[PDB]
Amino acid sequence: NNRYSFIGGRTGQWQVVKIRNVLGPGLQLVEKVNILNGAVAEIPLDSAWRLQGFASNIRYAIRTELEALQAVQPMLNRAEAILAVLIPIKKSAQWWEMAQDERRDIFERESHHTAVGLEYLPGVARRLLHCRDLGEEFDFLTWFEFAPEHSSAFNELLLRMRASKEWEYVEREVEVWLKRL
Amino acid sequence: NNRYSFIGGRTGQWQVVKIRNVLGPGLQLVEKVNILNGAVAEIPLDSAWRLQGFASNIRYAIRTELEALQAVQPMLNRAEAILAVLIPIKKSAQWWEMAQDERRDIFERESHHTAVGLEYLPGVARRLLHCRDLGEEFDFLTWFEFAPEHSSAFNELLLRMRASKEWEYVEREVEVWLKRL
Ligand code: HEM
Ligand code: HEM
Ligand SMILES: [Cl-]
Ligand SMILES: [Cl-]
Numbered sequence: 001n002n003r004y005s006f007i008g009g010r011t012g013q014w015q016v017v018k019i020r021n022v023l024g025p026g027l028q029l030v031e032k033v034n035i036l037n038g039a040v041a042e043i044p045l046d047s048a049w050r051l052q053g054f055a056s057n058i059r060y061a062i063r064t065e066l067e068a069l070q071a072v073q074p075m076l077n078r079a080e081a082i083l084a085v086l087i088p089i090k091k092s093a094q095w096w097e098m099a100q101d102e103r104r105d106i107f108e109r110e111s112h113h114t115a116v117g118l119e120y121l122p123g124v125a126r127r128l129l130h131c132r133d134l135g136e137e138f139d140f141l142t143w144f145e146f147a148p149e150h151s152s153a154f155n156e157l158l159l160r161m162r163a164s165k166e167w168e169y170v171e172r173e174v175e176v177w178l179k180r181l
Numbered sequence: 182n183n184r185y186s187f188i189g190g191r192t193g194q195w196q197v198v199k200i201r202n203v204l205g206p207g208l209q210l211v212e213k214v215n216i217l218n219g220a221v222a223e224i225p226l227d228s229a230w231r232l233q234g235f236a237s238n239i240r241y242a243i244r245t246e247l248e249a250l251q252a253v254q255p256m257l258n259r260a261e262a263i264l265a266v267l268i269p270i271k272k273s274a275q276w277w278e279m280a281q282d283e284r285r286d287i288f289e290r291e292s293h294h295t296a297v298g299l300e301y302l303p304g305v306a307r308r309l310l311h312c313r314d315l316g317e318e319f320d321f322l323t324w325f326e327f328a329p330e331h332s333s334a335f336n337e338l339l340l341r342m343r344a345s346k347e348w349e350y351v352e353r354e355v356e357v358w359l360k361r362l
């Protein structure tokens with residue numbers, strides 16, 4: 001199954017440390033996030049919100065970037081990666097109506113997304129889910145997990161991304177910080 | 182709603198003229214195709230099959246290409262566009278694991294998909310839907326409609342595309358030919 005669901009409420013494998021409502025309407029603070037590999041139609045009881053998305057193909061990265069990533073990126077579920085952060089993102093209509101070279105140019109040529117992210121590996125593990133195509137309120141669910149040593153660096157990464165040309169098109173962002181139970 | 186559904190069976194706005202099972206396991210012949218702008222979980226009565234997909238953002242076209250397409254491409258549901266073809270396509274795992282430069286190059290540099298397709302506009306109208314990400318048996322639903330004067334041409338276009346480098350990656354294909362009721 002390529003589909004993943006995230007349920008904020010009173011049960012789950014993760015503990016909510018905090019939520020930062022960076023841009024746009026936020027998400028309700030909850031005790032725990034429950035993550036599931038499937039669609040969930042039946043909104044669980046005592047649960048405040050459901051996010052979902054699917055794993056998909058590569059949209060921007062070229063072969064050499066891929067090769068560079070594969071050489072250093074960590075797997076998910078390292079025993080040390082006890083912190084995680086879920087970050088929903090929505091981009092503007094003006095971004096989606098742009099052609100594929102335009103978007104590529106802003107993503108790497110101008111914003112150096114891949115080159116910048118590479119500096120935070122192998123400390124940081126990541127997964128990218130897509131959800132615009134499902135009619136969700138957000139366009140993406142981004143997932144990061146790392147050992148505590150790296151929390152500082154990760155915060156530094158967030159502030160860099162948010163200073164890029166790419167982030168000018170971002171109209172909605174929440175940080176959900178988590179601790180593995 | 183970005184989601185479109187296509188049900189083969191005994192009702193619908195389109196009459197099946199023929200089904201050609203070009204490559205891989207085919208689709209059961211039926212009398213009609215019903216086309217709905219939404220999901221359909223409730224498997225309609227006396228229906229052989231259901232295909233669905235969503236409209237999405239551009240994946241390969243650059244801005245100059247988009248401009249050429251917009252100059253000439255016809256709208257859907259022109260009075261004279263009484264013939265239609267629905268063509269589900271699946272591409273190979275080996276296609277999907279390639280990077281974004283690699284697929285772009287096979288699609289346009291080697292295959293000239295857009296340049297070739299542009300020679301058949303404005304006779305032919307088209308819609309493109311994605312569905313690998315929904316877990317369907319096909320990766321794409323393609324939709325073409327035109328007046329009969331253009332049938333021979335459309336047939337020429339199919340044979341050109343299938344000789345392309347792109348089409349070496351196609352592992353499943355069906356043409357459903359239709360007539361508007
Ligand atoms: C930690 C290191 C990071 C690396 C190595 C990295 C790498 C990448 C790469 C290569 C892609 C393109 C995937 C594709 O071609 O489909 C991507 C997409 C994305 N990344 Fe990152 N990333 C990192 C961190 C982050 C962070 C911190 C955020 C947001 C807070 C973020 C947000 C995104 C988004 C939204 C996309 C999808 C872009 C779109 O389709 O418009 N990434 N990431
Ligand atoms: C009639 C003129 C045609 C034009 C102008 C045309 C144009 C295009 C364009 C510009 C794209 C790229 C969309 C993007 O960047 O997201 C595309 C994708 C596609 N076209 Fe065509 N097309 C035509 C005919 C056909 C035909 C006859 C077929 C199949 C029998 C076909 C199959 C496809 C498929 C499968 C894709 C998606 C490829 C992918 O995302 O991997 N096209 N078409
Ligand atoms: Cl990823
Ligand atoms: Cl289209």
